[PDB]
Design a protein around this nucleic acid. Structure first.
Ligand SMILES: Nc1nc2c([nH]c(=O)n2[C@@H]2O[C@H](COP(=O)(O)OP(=O)(O)OP(=O)(O)O)[C@@H](O)[C@H]2O)c(=O)[nH]1
Ligand SMILES: *P(=O)(O)OC[C@@H]1CC[C@H](n2ccc(N)nc2=O)O1
Ligand SMILES: [Mn+2]
Ligand SMILES: [Mn+2]
Ligand code: NA
Ligand code: NA
Ligand code: NA
Ligand code: NA
Length: 326
DNA sequence: CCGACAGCGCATCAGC
DNA sequence: GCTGATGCG
DNA sequence: GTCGG
């Protein structure tokens, strides 16, 4: 919060470029500058000072000066007053409605929560469910509730097959006191980079969580990735807990460490690390780290047995998950 | 100046 | 039905 | 929008 005013402005500009302008590289540029400023341990006094940080350039430096003088940014004040931009930005807040769909809906006169509810028939399943729980998905999850959810998931997974190993990652693994959702990594010795000796590995788990009424709806679902909705059970007479977003991802067991690194994040930390591995001649995804040859084509996976090994290959001093919330 | 910007699973549509 | 491109997160 | 080369 030391520079919360500046990071807020840059985040709003980023969302505008993504939702309205459909300029994804400007979106990431604003997010990168916002992340680097967010960890800068002084109260920024000027855009010149801010520009000394990597990722903050001339254009962002000028906007920081304006904000520090007046406390506002004219470019944003105009964007906030444009009904089309304002409607597009709102509709994208519904899960499954992206910049393209949002603009298409605004084009047809669908531009408010009310309009969306009248035209449920014009939404796909994902968007239909995002609308249904739009209000609940706006609330964060206290870490205490995350611990309750962790217990339910890990115990229900054990009851299907004691060989499962479910790991909660995301902001939870990074030590956050509150989370936007719950992210679950799943492994089973039957599923490795060498064979898939068991089918319906993920399905079995989803069905079990649906049986005990933990999972309440599904956004999408494939053989290795599930995105849906969950809800803690409420005690007698007390009010219902908010519905929550949950992702479950089954990963080959022998590739757990690249998977836990990828799903722990943060998303910006991933981008920074993966970009750096390229600078040093490697390519990292949630499964492996591979060397780049003379041509840039990926080589064979390198041996990995810990999160640190991946850091070693690219000459990075290891960083605890708590220190990866960029 | 200019090219690159991390990398991927699922849903949906167009084309054959 | 499959294959590729696009939207989405 | 930013930055290495
Ligand atoms: N949101 C987001 N997450 C990403 C991206 N790329 C990527 O690898 N991830 C990983 O996916 C994990 C789960 O997604 P998430 O949005 O819930 O991230 P989070 O747990 O840190 O934040 P949260 O507290 O709002 O839930 C992230 O921690 C991150 O490691 C991305 O582009 N956007
Ligand atoms: P969603 O649940 O609303 O956003 C969460 C997930 C986590 C990663 C995924 N994501 C988002 C954007 C991009 N570019 N790549 C991703 O994997 O959104
Ligand atoms: Mn999360
Ligand atoms: Mn998530
Ligand atoms: Na800079
Ligand atoms: Na959305
Ligand atoms: Na979030
Ligand atoms: Na609810």
């Amino acid at each position: 919060t030391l520079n919360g005013g500046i990071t807020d402005m840059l985040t709003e500009l980023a969302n505008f470029e993504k939702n309205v302008s459909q300029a994804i590289h400007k979106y990431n540029a604003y997010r990168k500058a916002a992340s680097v400023i967010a960890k800068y341990p002084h109260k920024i006094k000027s855009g010149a000072e801010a520009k000394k940080l990597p990722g903050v350039g001339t254009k962002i430096a000028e906007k920081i000066d304006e904000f520090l003088a007046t406390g506002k940014l004219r470019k944003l004040e105009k964007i906030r007053q444009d009904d089309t931009s304002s409607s597009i930005n709102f509709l994208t807040r519904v899960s499954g409605i992206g910049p393209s769909a949002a603009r298409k809906f605004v084009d047809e006169g669908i531009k408010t929560l009310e309009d969306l509810r009248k035209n449920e028939d014009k939404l796909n399943h994902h968007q239909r469910i995002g609308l249904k729980y739009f209000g609940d998905f706006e609330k964060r999850i206290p870490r205490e509730e995350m611990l309750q959810m962790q217990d339910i998931v890990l115990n229900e997974v054990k009851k299907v097959d004691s060989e499962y190993i479910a790991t909660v990652c995301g902001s939870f693994r990074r030590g956050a006191e509150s989370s936007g959702d719950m992210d679950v990594l799943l492994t089973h010795p039957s599923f490795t980079s060498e064979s898939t000796k068991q089918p319906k590995l993920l399905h079995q788990v989803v069905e079990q969580l649906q049986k005990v009424h933990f999972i309440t709806d599904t956004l999408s679902k494939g053989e290795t990735k599930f995105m849906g909705v969950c809800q803690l059970p409420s005690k007698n007479d007390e009010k219902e807990y908010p519905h929550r977003r949950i992702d479950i991802r089954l990963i080959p067991k022998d590739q757990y460490y690249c998977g836990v690194l990828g799903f722990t994040g943060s998303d910006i930390f991933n981008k920074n690390m993966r970009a750096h591995a390229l600078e040093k001649g490697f390519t990292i995804n949630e499964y492996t780290i591979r060397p780049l040859g003379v041509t840039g084509v990926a080589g064979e996976p390198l041996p990995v047995d810990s999160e640190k090994d991946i850091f070693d290959y690219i000459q990075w001093k290891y960083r605890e998950p708590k220190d990866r919330s960029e």
